[PDB]
Design a protein around this ligand. Structure first.
Ligand SMILES: *[C@@H]1O[C@H](CO)[C@@H](O[C@@H]2O[C@H](CO)[C@@H](O)[C@H](O)[C@H]2NC(C)=O)[C@H](O)[C@H]1NC(C)=O
Ligand SMILES: *[C@@H]1O[C@H](CO)[C@@H](O[C@@H]2O[C@H](CO)[C@@H](O)[C@H](O)[C@H]2NC(C)=O)[C@H](O)[C@H]1NC(C)=O
Ligand SMILES: *[C@@H]1O[C@H](CO)[C@@H](O[C@@H]2O[C@H](CO)[C@@H](O)[C@H](O)[C@H]2NC(C)=O)[C@H](O)[C@H]1NC(C)=O
Ligand SMILES: CCOCc1nc2c(N)nc3ccccc3c2n1CC(C)(C)O
Ligand SMILES: CCOCc1nc2c(N)nc3ccccc3c2n1CC(C)(C)O
Ligand SMILES: *[C@@H]1O[C@H](CO)[C@@H](O)[C@H](O)[C@H]1NC(C)=O
Ligand SMILES: *[C@@H]1O[C@H](CO)[C@@H](O)[C@H](O)[C@H]1NC(C)=O
Ligand SMILES: *[C@@H]1O[C@H](CO)[C@@H](O)[C@H](O)[C@H]1NC(C)=O
Ligand SMILES: *[C@@H]1O[C@H](CO)[C@@H](O)[C@H](O)[C@H]1NC(C)=O
Ligand SMILES: *[C@@H]1O[C@H](CO)[C@@H](O)[C@H](O)[C@H]1NC(C)=O
Ligand SMILES: *[C@@H]1O[C@H](CO)[C@@H](O)[C@H](O)[C@H]1NC(C)=O
Ligand SMILES: *[C@@H]1O[C@H](CO)[C@@H](O)[C@H](O)[C@H]1NC(C)=O
Ligand SMILES: *[C@@H]1O[C@H](CO)[C@@H](O)[C@H](O)[C@H]1NC(C)=O
Ligand SMILES: *[C@@H]1O[C@H](CO)[C@@H](O)[C@H](O)[C@H]1NC(C)=O
Ligand SMILES: *[C@@H]1O[C@H](CO)[C@@H](O)[C@H](O)[C@H]1NC(C)=O
Ligand SMILES: *[C@@H]1O[C@H](CO)[C@@H](O)[C@H](O)[C@H]1NC(C)=O
Ligand SMILES: *[C@@H]1O[C@H](CO)[C@@H](O)[C@H](O)[C@H]1NC(C)=O
Lengths: 772, 772
């Protein structure tokens, strides 16, 4: 019990080690900077509110600020919400920041500013002005930034935030910023590389602009540069998901053979979507240290068969040559130059979108002696034919990616095609060697398909066309396999011996194999688990399972079963007792997800039929309208119960008399109108309680004893129907004074009434008239 | 417009032609019979309420009743709701019905009654007592029913409603019911056919019981019998979705060879799930008239190859032999006896679940000269091989059904396996010859697959594995095809010539082909419609479409496009204008469904890009948060606008000023809190307005002018947040007195407040204190 309730609508955190006082008002529907921000505040975040102006009054007392993050209070129209459009650009009055003598970082992105704010203090190292309307950079406006190290100025002139002219940078605008390390002028309608830049630069971002030519002297003095990105100048526009204008005459970005001669420290060079047709070896004459080269989205199909430049790249770790195919050509095979065999240090090679019919072992020979190679990505190639046995020569790899091909007998889903993959907003690999054949056209498998692949630890066959009864013979070579992803196929579980040859299998995913489960009368052996002696996790979600020939699933090893998106309602049809012990003999089961099974009620017998060590149970999203809480007594190890998104109207009379073990109880999104008188009495093991999005009007102390409440890690109460009368005096006082974490106090823990108090936050509620 | 507002919570309808006054109180959450039921009431329905008793008071004034339907006021526990269980059986006091001199039909199903109710009037023709607890029938209890024609007594003793003993029927119980035509004793735990039954019977239902044997004289005197159902006596229990006990020693229902000799009028004989191994021809010696025979779910696999009995069935119209397979046998081929060729009158033949590998032309030769044959169903057979050309000999058929097989180069989904398909609760065929290959394993198609099939009007390929670029060559022989269902495949629309060879195609479904639309960078030609010159309807739902190589779809014929479940939000990304005319050149488009496209706002240009004759537009389920109503002015022929299930908060100031053509406006399930002052002023075209499930508090007269309300066919206002204060005087009076059709007045047009009035129906609201 606090003496001084916190009324500030911001989260406040103390890191006493670094003398930091962190005040986070992100997304609090503020129209002004709140009063009462601590005087010792060092980090203030006001991102995503609607504060229309800054003034000397804004940060007057806050002389210790090292960081102000004031992003996105007035976002450009095409980037922002159309339902609450910002009426007018952010107004910054003079002298708003000059008193902030300690200020090291100022983020003003996304405020529709017209100029670089002046009057900035000389302590400043980082200034961020992305997604404003600043499209002319003048030396005079940069004087104030003598000590600046990091300067983000991109996204001020592009299709989502147009300025309708070419960007302008004055000659030498940046040269006297003698500490400047990082400069980003991406997405800006820039026409030439600005010169001369300070020789202190380590990173220069010039991507997504209109630079048609690099001058031979553009990067001459940049002997500390580590990252250079020039991508998206003369873009390759085929199937671009954004408005795309190529350089005329089908020209590439014109880079002189000596343009990079000064860049002795360069580790990263990105030349994505520059419409390049050749890669001159001479580019790399004085760069020995290069680690990452991106040449995706050019027209380098022919060059890949020649590629003399690779002889200059013995320290390269990553090479990307994806999407270099020649339009309207479907090549017979892949032609990799012998020069690839020079890439001594290569760990990652990506060649998506080369677009060819047949992959053959001899085509990968240039890679045979790359000892460090960990990832080979040949996805999205429309490969029809590939003998998988070729990968016996690639046992050292971590991931072989043939995803999205047409074979028959982790990068973001948008990655190569998106406009700016580093734009800022307001998995089985860890098991060992992985062969990813997801999203192919495999319709039938047999043992011989996997000959010589016994070293594989993860096989991903998700999203193939496999419509086959498995009998234990199809995967015989895969003696080491620990993870099989068989999701999104048409498994037919006619035989209980399915998968038994995978003797080291720990995780099996057969989710989204609903096809044979959808048609009446068909045999399904759900007892196939018995044979899998180290199986830890089974996923069988979204299989629409409503019938089973076997009555029990069996396993001595299984710990986790996901059974979401089935029809246990039909299996457990009231009057039919036959499947009430379906999961009972999964003796080591700790986690069971039976959400989304249309269970509007639970027949008696379900809880008695649960296996004895069940710890985490989800019954979410079932339309459940009633629930006999007493039956939780059968679940002696139960720690997490998820009943979210149902239609429950009551809680147990005594949660302690239903379950002694329960730590996490999730009742969000139900129809609960009141709590029982002694609901939480003596529930000392309770740690997490979600009652949000219900219809609760009143809570009294008997239901919510203080010796239970003060031990919760989290208590969620938001989006209820609290009635703020004199009867609510205890709850209101308790909420205002507690240290228990209750999220959304500042925003969605609100009185609905009476009258005067409607829409008011309970945190701000003054009930003195109740005590007169 | 009314002087006497209707307060009765039942719908009341007049059919003056048959002198009927129909009062329907179905599902009105009634706990008593309401007062004020009209004295002239002829049909009274009180089904699905919680009225706990009937007495002389119940129907006292209602002397003209011809029908009382009082079903399901206390349903058996396993059949009923578990959230509102019925506490005690319905109580009927003496003399409750004897005054109802005209009563012809009494339904008392599903009330947990213990006996046949006595004191019934002699006018009664139909009595229904299904799903009660009456399991002993005595002659004495039936004397009141001298005039009874129809008697339903089933579902009184079975697994969903157990009685724990065998059913008992006294000897000759029914014999003196000399007008009895229809008797149903299904689902009753009956052990013998009751005898002697009255010779006036036309239909006898004895299915789902424990009859082990028919005696030779059980049906001797039933010379008027038309329908006999003995199914589910000695059931075939393999994969039964209900608890199933077979007769011992695998015995069939034992039927003597002469058991049916008296049944000269018999038209329908159902012997489903009787575990039959033979069908003696002698059964049918004296039945010439038989039209329908069901022999599904027996063990007749061998008999189908012999089938001498078919020689006695020259008038049979329908024959069902589905699910006769031998357990654990997968036959090479199907062996139909030559005797099938004697089925001169046959229209429908179903043989699902025979379970065989290969279908060959010669196997169907016994059917070649059945001239009347219209439907051939060989679904659910696990057929792997079938030359589709064989169906050139079957051009006279209406439907050829090979659904749910494994072929590679309309009955309810539960039908053959369900317990009782006639249990009572409380498509392209019309285009002509149909070949249904849905739910097969076809992975690649070519022209020659359809050789000799040019007569087909509808082809169903839904749910195959077709992952192929189509180029206009794959369907060349299908010259007459009007409907292609290509849904649930993996169409790759690389070429705009896809489907062009289907020159007569009127409807194309390519819904749920999302696979190639889900991976970035892939080419997709949505302009493939240009070539299809009679195409009327295109469905491309749930394709996840977020990119297109072509900018415009084109067609001179298309009238209906379904484009639901895509990502128009990504295609029309704010700042990208390229796809704003995607639909503009569908010049004859009248119907466009762009629901479920994540459209949280509509970019400007969308409405100007719509084609000119658009009449019906759905933007439902988009998360729409704002809407510029004025843009509706571009849609000059707009008649239906569906904006349901969005997050709109306001209506236009003047709908008339946004659209002159709009007739139907659907705003249900939005967040509207108030209407604009003059919302409907001069909206003379408006005919239908749905404002249900919003948050409206008050409506005043200005918003709703009488000269618009007078032309409304329907105005939906239920599930709002009406505040019943003195400011609501107009709305409350208007609702009570209007003739405009407003559904759910009895149930869901309710005050939320203030206090006293909470949960009260507005129809019942008395505001006299406002006028004092
Ligand atoms: C508070 O503000 C300071 C100043 O911007 C932040 O300091 C940065 O912290 C990380 C450590 O995780 C470093 O790698 C950066 O280089 C630091 N920058 C400077 C300029 O000191 C600090 O992280 C902020 N803390 C918050 C918001 O919690
Ligand atoms: C990028 O700069 C160009 C000019 O280099 C802008 O193009 C001009 O736009 C105006 C108004 O749209 C036209 O009337 C001029 O004719 C254009 N000039 C040229 C030379 O193209 C372009 O809009 C700028 N891009 C962005 C996104 O703001
Ligand atoms: C159908 O009738 C049989 C009796 O013919 C019922 O089975 C008996 O049930 C009692 C109580 O469960 C048992 O003690 C007897 O052993 C059973 N007898 C036999 C012969 O099986 C059965 O309960 C009835 N079915 C239903 C659905 O009520
Ligand atoms: C009407 C079918 O009844 C059971 C059944 N289930 C399957 C099944 N899940 N898959 C099958 C695959 C090939 C052949 C037969 C079957 C099969 N069958 C047929 C059977 C002979 C029993 O295997
Ligand atoms: C990275 C791929 O970009 C374009 C494309 N789209 C498809 C497509 N939808 N399907 C294909 C099928 C076979 C071979 C090539 C393609 C193909 N291709 C390759 C192309 C050469 C244009 O045909
Ligand atoms: C591979 O590519 C190079 C292009 O420089 C070409 O000279 C060579 O003939 C090609 N080999 C094959 C097998 O196509
Ligand atoms: C696949 O490659 C292996 C050699 O690693 C060989 O045994 C096998 O015969 C090849 N398969 C086919 C189908 O050519
Ligand atoms: C397998 O590939 C699919 C589809 O590409 C992906 O979503 C899935 O997570 C992968 N599976 C595993 C286990 O990594
Ligand atoms: C499993 O199927 C394969 C053919 O795909 C066959 O070789 C084998 O005999 C089958 N195994 C058993 C145990 O029946
Ligand atoms: C699985 O299902 C049933 C018993 O419930 C039986 O037909 C089959 O032999 C069983 N197989 C295993 C591995 O338990
Ligand atoms: C009214 O009851 C009579 C007699 O049962 C019946 O024939 C008629 O269909 C009923 N009408 C309606 C509308 O339910
Ligand atoms: C098919 O079936 C019957 C078995 O009932 C057998 O007598 C007959 O010879 C078989 N005929 C053919 C053509 O296989
Ligand atoms: C299918 O049968 C037809 C005769 O109707 C014949 O032309 C064709 O050869 C058969 N096709 C195949 C692939 O066997
Ligand atoms: C085609 O078959 C599927 C069932 O497999 C069914 O859902 C669909 O409605 C049928 N299509 C048509 C046009 O009848
Ligand atoms: C279309 O595809 C078929 C078979 O794949 C082939 O016969 C034909 O060459 C193709 N037509 C065109 C115009 O490419
Ligand atoms: C479809 O789209 C592209 C232009 O994006 C064009 O090449 C192609 O010929 C068009 N086809 C038709 C049938 O209009
Ligand atoms: C909307 O109302 C104004 C004022 O009456 C009128 O001038 C304007 O033309 C109207 N527009 C339409 C489309 O009716």
């Amino acid at each position: 019990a606090r003496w001084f309730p916190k009324t500030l609508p911001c989260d406040v955190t103390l890191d006493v080690s670094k003398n930091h006082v962190i005040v986070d008002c992100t997304d609090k529907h503020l129209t002004e900077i709140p009063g009462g921000i601590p005087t010792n505040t060092t980090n203030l975040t006001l991102t995503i509110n609607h504060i229309p102006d800054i003034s000397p009054a804004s940060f007057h007392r806050l002389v210790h600020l090292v960081e102000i993050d004031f992003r996105c209070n007035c976002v450009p129209i095409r980037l922002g919400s159309k339902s609450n459009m910002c009426p007018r650009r952010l107004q910054i009055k003079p002298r708003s920041f000059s008193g902030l003598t300690y200020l090291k970082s100022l983020y003003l992105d996304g405020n529709q500013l017209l100029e670089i704010p002046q009057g900035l203090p000389p302590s400043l190292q980082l200034l961020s002005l992305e997604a404003n309307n600043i499209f002319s950079i003048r030396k005079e406006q940069l004087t104030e930034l003598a000590n600046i190290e990091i300067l983000y100025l991109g996204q001020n002139c592009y299709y989502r935030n147009p300025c309708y002219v070419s960007y302008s940078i004055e000659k030498d605008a940046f040269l006297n910023l003698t500490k400047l390390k990082v400069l980003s002028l991406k997405d800006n309608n820039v026409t030439t590389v600005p010169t001369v830049l300070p020789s202190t630069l380590t990173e220069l971002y010039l991507y997504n602009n209109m630079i048609a030519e690099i001058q031979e002297d553009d990067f001459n003095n940049l002997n500390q540069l580590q990252i250079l990105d020039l991508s998206g100048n003369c873009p390759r526009c085929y199937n671009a998901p954004f408005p795309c204008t190529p350089c005329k005459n089908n020209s590439p970005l014109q880079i002189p053979v000596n343009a990079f001669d000064a860049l002795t420290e360069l580790k990263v060079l990105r030349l994505h979507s520059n419409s390049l047709q050749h890669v001159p070896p001479r580019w790399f004459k004085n760069i020995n240290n290069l680690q990452e080269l991106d040449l995706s989205q050019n027209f380098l199909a022919k060059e890949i068969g020649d590629a003399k430049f690779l002889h200059f790249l013995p320290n390269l770790i990553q090479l990307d040559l994806s999407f270099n195919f020649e339009l309207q050509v479907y090549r017979a095979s892949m032609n990799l130059s012998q020069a690839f065999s020079s890439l001594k240090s290569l760990k990652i090679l990506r060649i998506r979108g080369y677009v060819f019919k047949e992959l053959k072992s001899f085509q990968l020979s240039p890679l045979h002696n790359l000892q460090n190679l960990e990832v080979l990505d040949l996805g999205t190639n429309f490969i029809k034919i590939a003998n998988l046995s070729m990968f016996k020569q690639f046992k050292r790899l971590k991931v072989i990616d043939l995803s999205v091909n047409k074979i028959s007998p982790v990068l973001e889903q948008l990655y190569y095609f998106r406009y700016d993959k580093y734009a800022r907003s307001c998995s089985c690999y860890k098991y060992g060697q992985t062969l990813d054949l997801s999203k192919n056209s495999i319709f039938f498998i047999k043992s011989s398909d996997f000959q010589h692949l016994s070293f594989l630890k993860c096989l991903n066959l998700s999203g193939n066309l496999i419509s086959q009864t498995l009998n234990g013979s199809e995967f015989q070579p895969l003696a080491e396999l620990r993870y099989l992803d068989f999701s999104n196929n048409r498994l037919d579980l006619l035989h209980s011996t399915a998968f038994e040859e995978l003797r080291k299998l720990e995780v099996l995913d057969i989710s989204s194999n609903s096809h044979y489960f959808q048609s009446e009368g068909i045999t399904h052996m759900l007892n196939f688990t018995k044979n899998l002696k180290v199986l830890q996790k089974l996923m069988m979600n979204d299989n629409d399972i409503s019938s089973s020939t076997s009555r029990t699933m069996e396993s001595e090893s299984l710990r986790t079963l996901e059974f979401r998106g089935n029809h246990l309602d039909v299996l457990w049809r009231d009057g039919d007792n036959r499947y009430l012990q379906l999961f009972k003999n999964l003796l080591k089961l700790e986690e069971l997800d039976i959400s989304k099974n249309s269970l509007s009620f639970l027949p008696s017998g379900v809880f008695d039929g649960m296996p004895p060590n069940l710890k985490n149970l989800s019954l979410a999203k079932n339309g459940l309208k009633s629930f006999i809480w007493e039956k939780l007594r059968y679940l002696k190890n139960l720690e997490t119960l998820d009943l979210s998104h149902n239609q429950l109207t009551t809680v147990p009379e005594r949660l302690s008399n239903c379950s002694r073990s329960l730590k996490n109880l999730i009742l969000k999104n139900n129809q609960i109108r009141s709590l029982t008188k002694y609901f939480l009495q003596d529930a000392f093991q309770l740690r997490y309680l979600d009652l949000s999005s219900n219809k609760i009007q009143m809570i009294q102390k008997t239901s919510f004893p203080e010796n239970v409440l003060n031990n919760l890690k989290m208590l969620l109460l938001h989006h209820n129907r609290f009635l703020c009368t004199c009867d609510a005096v205890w709850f209101v006082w308790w909420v205002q004074h507690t240290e228990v974490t209750i999220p959304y106090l500042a925003t969605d823990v609100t009185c609905v009434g009476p009258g005067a108090h409607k829409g008011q936050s309970v945190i701000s509620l003054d009930l003195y008239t109740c005590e007169l």
